[PDB]
Design goal:
Protein name (chains A, B, C, D, E, F, G, H, I, J): Nuclear pore complex protein Nup98
Helix content of chain A: under 10%
Shape of chain A: flat
Oligomer: homodecamer
Structural class of chain A: little secondary structure
Entry title: GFGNFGTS from low-complexity/FG repeat domain of Nup98, residues 116-123
Largest interface: A-B, 8 and 8 residues
Assembly: decameric
Largest sheet of chain A: none
Distance between the termini of chain A: 11 Å
Number of helices of chain A: 0
Strand content of chain A: under 5%
Number of strands of chain A: 0
PDB class: protein fibril
Keywords: Amyloid, larks, Reversible-amyloid, low-complexity, FG repeat, protein fibril
């Protein structure tokens, strides 16, 4: 993944 | 995934 | 992954 | 991975 | 800002 | 801003 | 702003 | 800023 | 800033 | 990996 903020 | 904010 | 901030 | 900040 | 992905 | 994906 | 995806 | 990926 | 990846 | 800050 890329450019993700705070994901689970 | 990409460009996701706070997803579960 | 790349450019991810605080992901789990 | 690269350019990741605080990921687990 | 913080946690931004891209150009500014 | 924070957690933005793209251009600004 | 935060959590925006795209251009601004 | 901190935790930014890209150009500024 | 800190923890930045790219050009400024 | 490269250019990573505080990752686990």
């Amino acid at each position: 993944g890329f450019g993700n903020f705070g994901t689970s």
